[PDB]
Structures are given as structure tokens and as C-alpha cells.
Amino acid sequence: SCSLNLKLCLMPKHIALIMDGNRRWAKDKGLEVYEGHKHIIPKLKEICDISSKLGIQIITAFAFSTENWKRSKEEVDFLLQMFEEIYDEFSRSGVRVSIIGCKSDLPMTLQKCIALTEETTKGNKGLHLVIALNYGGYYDILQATKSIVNKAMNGLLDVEDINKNLFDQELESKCPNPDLLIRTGGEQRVSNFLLWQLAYTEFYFTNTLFPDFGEEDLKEAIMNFQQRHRRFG
Amino acid sequence: ISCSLNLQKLCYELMPKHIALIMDGNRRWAKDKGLEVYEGHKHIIPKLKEICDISSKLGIQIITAFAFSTENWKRSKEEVDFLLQMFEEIYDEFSRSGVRVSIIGCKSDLPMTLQKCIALTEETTKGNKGLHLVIALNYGGYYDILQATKSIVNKAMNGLLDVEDINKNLFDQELESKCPNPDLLIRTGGEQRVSNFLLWQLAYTEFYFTNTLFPDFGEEDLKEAIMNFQQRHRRFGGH
């Protein structure tokens, strides 16, 4: 049953992004909380454009977590309505857009915008933006477990077949995994993002709040990443 | 094929109840002091014992320590054999302490002499009422999640559970590192990553990284990490 000693999948190919700090940013400027949230999609679009030029291929971005449901009804409804603007900002861009997470919990207004945004952009050969909306690492690992159990029940596989590669092919976020993770907002934790996929990722935390995160901030993170690899082997 | 996450569990929380520890920086430390390659490794078990003593007094209840990873097998045979022989010291160092000691990881890959020492160390200390030290030896987060998955699959095949039972609590009970999860993770050695340690369990853990190499990590360094932890604001996704 056991055996472990005897492949896992300059510039980082895949960047993961935790877009934290939006509320504090607004509250600082005497603004209402919602003003902060309004910068999310525009900023992300702007970041995709900068990254696309640098040669980055994938960005996975944390927009809403399975724990975010615990916020006030007011705040939640506002965020889930706001995410409709994903269509406007991306539908006519050069970016290919996928969503990961539990779609069925979201308003049908939002469900339709998402499906449409995916359909319209599915052909773009540029940067692939993955938006994690109603997502969690616990959820990802559990839905992969259920899917593997179903396969074993239907005679498709044996317990001896269950390995890293098999499990990887059932997760919503797949190889190649993030080379670098950037978390804005000053906190040093992963908050139930891509738990499996971050096993060997480099972590970069900045105190810069997400709405102030610009090209200069990004280029710094990448510079820091390249210094880590000079002393890594 | 049906998901639902909307109406929902976490195993967290002055003092951190559970500290996870990545012990990095041993070879650099020796090479700096002009000592032998493996001189750094010789500080592991002593330091751990010392850290348990300090932590135990402070009111900490659990320490999980990363001693050997699934990726460490790729080091030289010389270095590997030395480490695996050195882990035999676990019995001497802990057997007569007040500390309860468990090992997580794939025990069957290890030399039988090591397997026996481990089982003995576990048996002797299983009754102690003080601090629980978990030593991750031949462990990885990928391995932990996979062995839990196989166990769940076997049960479903034998009619002992169905797919609608598979949830966070179920999975927690099948993993080798269980609730309560780490409140704080300390990584010595200056690098900022988790290197396939407790992937599932670190979901809401606070991370502290220090440039201090592990052999120089002492009581003052530890109290600093704890002080840093106590400043932090944990929201767990709320406001």
C-alpha cells in the first residue's frame, strides 16, 4: 500500500493572484466598502495586459472564496452582481477566460454572463485567465475525490491506479501549476486557495493593497522571483 | 455531479495551539563554520527536544516538524543513509521525557531498525499527558491526500459509505495530520514556500519566515515568531 522513494507535471509561466485589500483601501479614503470592490475587474484586466506583454501564459486569480459567503448579505449581493461586468471587460479582449468553482450556487444572471464570457473568448490564443469564483482548495480536492470514487465503482480503476497524475487530471486547476504566487493586502496566508497546486510555488506577499497594485509592483514581484531561482540550485 | 457550498467547520485557534515547523538551513550553517557537511543535521533532534521544552512551558499543545520529505530521497546515498541512521536517536532523546511522540509518513520504506525504534518510541510515550510532538518522516502533502483518497475509495467499494458522505469532516478523519490544524507555521532557512508539507492542513495557517538557519534557531527566535503571530488579524474569509 506504501511506496515513496522509487515527473511532477527566467520568467514565471503561471502566476496565481490573491486580490486582497479592497475594503481597507476604500475605508482609508473615507469611501464606502463597495467603492473598493469596483476596482477588481478593471485592475485584473490591466494586470492581464501588462502580463501578456511580459510573456506570461497563465494567471489564476482569486475573486471569491467558499468562505466569503459569511460576509453580510448586502456585501455579498453587491459582489455577485458586480461580477456580471466580467462580460463587458473581457468579451471583446484578446484574453481567453475560464471560471473555476461551484457555478450552480451563483445567480442565473451571473451564470449566464460567465457561460457567455467563456464561449466568446474560448478562441483567443493569448494569455489564459482563470477566475476562481465560489472556489476553495477544500472544494477542489473533495470534488476530485468524489469523481475518483465514481470511477472505481464503475470498474474503471483500481486503488493501485490512484496516484499524483490521476488526481491532477481530476482537479479544476491542473498542471502546469503556479510558479509564483502574489498576494496583495499585507496578510501572510493562502486562505484556502489552490492548496494542492501550490506545493512547490514561490510565495510573494506585499503590503500594497490590490487597487494600488500596478505595473511597477508586478515587475518587482517578478524581479524578486528571479533572484530566488539564482540561489535555487 | 452536483455542488453546493452556499450554506455551511474550521479547526483553528493569545497563544497558538499548534505550531508547524520547517527546519531548513543545516548544510549552509555547517559550511559557514568550516565544519563537516552533515554537522548541521546533528542538531535536529536536540533542537526539537529543546523547542518542545520551551513551547510546552508557554502553553503550546502540538508541534508538527518536517524532518524528511518525499523529495529528500533524491539527495546523495551518503547523505540519505546518514540522516536515516541519525533518526534512530529519537528513542534515546524522547523515551524518558514528558512528551507524547507520533510519526507520520510512509514507515514501510524505512530501514527495519528505524521502523522498530519508531514503534517503540510511540508505544513508550503514548501515555504522556504533555505536549504532542508529531514528526513527519518520509512525508508529503501529496502522499497524505492520496492515502486518504484510497482509504475512502475502499470504503465506498465495500458499502461502508456513499459519495454523499464525502465532505471536509470525513477527509479530515482519514488524513494522518488531523484537526486541530496549525495556527502558525515557522520556516527557518530564508526560503518562502511550503515544499509539499501539510497542504490540506495549512489552508488558514499564518506563515512566519525567518532567515535564521535552523541550528541557530533558539528561544529568543521562537519568542519573536510567537510575538509576530499575536499581532496578526485572522478573518477566515469574513469581516
Ligand SMILES: CC(C)=CCSP(=O)(O)OP(=O)(O)O
Ligand atoms: C473579495 C475579494 C475579491 C478579495 C478580498 S479583498 P476584501 O474585501 O477581503 O478586503 P479587506 O481584506 O477587508 O481589505
Ligand SMILES: CC(C)=CCSP(=O)(O)OP(=O)(O)O
Ligand atoms: C530537515 C532536513 C531534511 C534538512 C535540514 S535543512 P538543509 O539540509 O536543506 O540545509 P540547506 O538548505 O542545504 O542549507
Ligand SMILES: CC(C)=CCSP(=O)(O)OP(=O)(O)O
Ligand atoms: C522541507 C524540509 C523538511 C527540509 C528541507 S528539504 P530542501 O532544503 O530541499 O527544501 P526546499 O526544496 O529548498 O524547499
Ligand SMILES: CC(C)=CCSP(=O)(O)OP(=O)(O)O
Ligand atoms: C482573494 C479572495 C477572493 C479570497 C481570499 S482573501 P479574504 O480576505 O477572504 O481572506 P482572509 O480573511 O484574510 O483569510
Ligand SMILES: [Mg+2]
Ligand atoms: Mg481580505
Ligand SMILES: [Mg+2]
Ligand atoms: Mg534546505
Ligand SMILES: [Mg+2]
Ligand atoms: Mg508526497
